[PDB]
Ligand binder design. Structure first.
Ligand SMILES: Nc1ncnc2c1ncn2[C@@H]1O[C@H](COP(=O)(O)OP(=O)(O)O)[C@@H](O)[C@H]1O
Ligand SMILES: [Mg+2]
Lengths: 526, 43, 33
């Protein structure tokens, strides 16, 4: 007898449970709903979605990113929660692939539902899927191509990867310009994976084509009152000192005198201490001074008297980026000027972007830190462009880390599914049926890609399957006019890491959800 | 958020109640933050 | 001077649950009737 369907009641008020039919049905409906929601935003012809917040602020967000869509939705279905967390983890691990992994998991779970309807034990499906995943992973690894040795071919691969990543976003309008921008920004990192070193500034107004990658650096801070507004051949000193009534850190100390003259003497001593601090700072022979914390009126007056630029309140990210771009050292003590390296740049000036004024560093020494100015017509456009640029930069950094690349446009899915089908053709039992369903989902991915463009998806997928079975391992969807073509010639390439992560995460989450045969819910707080 | 009284500027933005050396403070919804590093240090 | 102006699955067809809960249903139904 079931727990809920028994004469005696064993549950608190509001707590229930769902047995075989109900649990599997709930899981499958949740997964299919999530997959159908996230899809239609997939491929070069995917469309965007509007996310209306129900809160008091009522935030507006139009986006194409699958993870962003899945994060900002009220989800109560536990399997849907599993898929949402899968997409979030995929976004954390790599840039793109958030929609692909979700759609693949949903298709796998649809095939699992169909198989369960055919009286096949879910554990058999899991074993068949494990074997299929092994075969597909081996095929994808064998199909990978590496061009990290040759610089020109690696740069071409980076351009192709950035273009493929941006083809599905709102940036596809200026894909060429934005791809060049992203590739330059990533290459300026000098091999570092620090994506925080790339700062994206969104300024309203102007055109999307007006966006650019600054040759130097841009800071959104302000200069002091009497400080110079323009420095040539600047010598930078990046600091993280107090400089705001810098109190001696003996917090048990107090001034305990018997006259106001002594109090005046002590405050003069404090001012003299601050002046000596500024003098020690100036002993380094500097023209500009960026401090992470605030700079009060007396130190900035001293700096203006010394005629050196003093930028204040540049947060931890700001000072880190300035150190990366100018080569300086973030110093908190100034007793050994010879042991502190000073940042350098050719010119510092104030630039006028939109209606706001920003500090511009030109002719930087190192340059291993980028600032990207994004211009748009709406705040929604700026946010979506920032998200798309983040995707492109993430994928480019991953490719820099691991230079192995695979061919997109459904070619990788087609070859993996062909390997899965070949394995299934020599396997007895219902495991072969499970393998065939796995290959069916792998086919269904480029099928959805073709459907989103309005092409004849069935015929195109049949042509791709025939071409891959024949031996044309580089065949893929040509989305320019709706035919099939050589992905190597067309330059539709992807990161091997992204595709492998999509495959493995989708298979893992499908296996996790398929194992559930009972969903027990506790009584909610409300 | 913590603000500088004299300069009237937002030092750093990070909570039904919170309590505090004016460098380490704990916020409850524990979440201990250090102003020297601007990161959560205890939980 | 000083002197101035200042001054899916919708079809459920629930099967046995109604049988299990008919006791409470009739418990409320008698008072409601
Ligand atoms: N120019 C192109 N030609 C053919 N296929 C493409 C092209 N650009 C992207 N795709 C395909 O569209 C799919 C979806 O990519 P996208 O929606 O940008 O991100 P995600 O992989 O997170 O869905 C990818 O698997 C890729 O193979
Ligand atoms: Mg993408």
């Amino acid at each position: 007898a079931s727990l809920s369907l028994a004469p005696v009641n064993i549950f608190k008020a509001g707590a229930d449970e769902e047995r075989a039919e109900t649990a599997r049905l709930t899981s499958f409906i949740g997964a299919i709903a999530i997959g159908d929601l996230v899809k239609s935003t997939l491929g070069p012809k995917g469309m965007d979605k509007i996310l209306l917040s129900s809160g008091r602020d009522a935030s507006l967000m139009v986006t194409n990113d699958g993870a962003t869509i899945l994060k900002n939705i009220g989800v109560d279905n536990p399997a849907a929660k599993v898929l949402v967390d899968m997409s979030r983890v995929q976004d954390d691990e790599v840039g793109d692939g958030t929609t692909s992994v979700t759609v693949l998991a949903a298709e796998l779970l649809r095939e699992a539902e169909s198989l369960i309807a055919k009286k096949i034990h879910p554990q058999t499906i899991i074993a068949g899927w494990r074997e299929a995943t092994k075969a597909a992973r081996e095929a994808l690894l064998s199909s990978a191509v590496d061009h990290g040795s040759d610089e020109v071919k690696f740069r071409q691969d980076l351009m192709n990867i950035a273009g493929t990543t941006l083809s599905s976003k709102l940036l596809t309008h200026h894909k060429d310009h934005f791809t060049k921008l992203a590739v330059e920004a990533v290459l300026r990192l000098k091999g570092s994976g620090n994506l925080e070193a790339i700062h994206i500034i969104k300024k309203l107004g102007g055109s999307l084509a007006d966006s650019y990658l600054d040759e130097g650096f841009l800071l959104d801070k302000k200069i002091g009152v009497n400080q110079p507004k323009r420095i040539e051949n600047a010598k930078i000193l990046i600091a993280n000192t107090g400089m705001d009534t810098d109190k001696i850190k003996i917090f048990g100390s107090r001034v305990r005198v018997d006259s106001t003259a002594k109090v005046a003497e002590i405050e003069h001593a404090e001012k003299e201490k601050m002046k000596e601090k500024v003098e020690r700072i100036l002993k380094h022979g500097i023209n500009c001074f960026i401090n992470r914390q605030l700079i009060y009126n007396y130190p900035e007056q001293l700096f203006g008297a010394a005629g050196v630029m003093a930028i204040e309140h540049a947060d931890f990210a700001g000072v880190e980026r300035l150190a990366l771009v100018t080569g300086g050292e973030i110093a908190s003590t100034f007793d050994h000027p010879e042991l502190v390296k000073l940042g350098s740049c050719k010119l510092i000036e104030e630039v006028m972007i939109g209606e706001d004024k920003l500090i511009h560093f030109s002719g930087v020494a190192l340059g291993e830190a980028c600032t990207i100015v994004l211009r748009g017509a709406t705040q929604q456009i700026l946010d979506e462009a920032e998200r798309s640029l983040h995707d492109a930069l993430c994928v480019l950094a991953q490719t820099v880390k691991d230079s192995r690349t695979v061919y997109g446009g459904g070619c990788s899915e087609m070859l993996m599914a062909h390997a899965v089908t070949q394995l299934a053709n020599r396997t007895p039992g219902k495991e072969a049926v499970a393998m065939e369903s796995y290959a069916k989902a792998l086919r269904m991915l480029p099928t959805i890609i073709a459907d989103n463009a309005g092409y004849d998806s069935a015929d195109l997928v049949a042509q791709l399957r025939a071409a891959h079975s024949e031996g044309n391992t580089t065949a893929g969807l040509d989305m320019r006019e709706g035919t099939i073509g050589d992905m190597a010639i067309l330059g539709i390439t992807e990161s091997f890491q992204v595709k492998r992560q999509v495959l493995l995460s989708a298979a893992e989450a499908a296996e996790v959800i398929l194992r559930v045969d009972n969903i027990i819910k506790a009584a909610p707080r409300k | 958020a913590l603000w500088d009284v004299e300069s009237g500027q937002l030092l750093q933005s990070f909570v039904l109640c919170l309590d505090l050396t004016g460098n380490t403070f704990v916020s409850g919804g524990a979440m201990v933050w250090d102003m020297r590093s601007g990161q959560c240090v205890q939980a | 001077s000083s002197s101035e102006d200042e001054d899916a699955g919708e079809g459920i067809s629930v099967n046995t649950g109604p049988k299990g809960v008919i006791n409470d249903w009739r418990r409320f139904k008698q008072l409601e009737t």
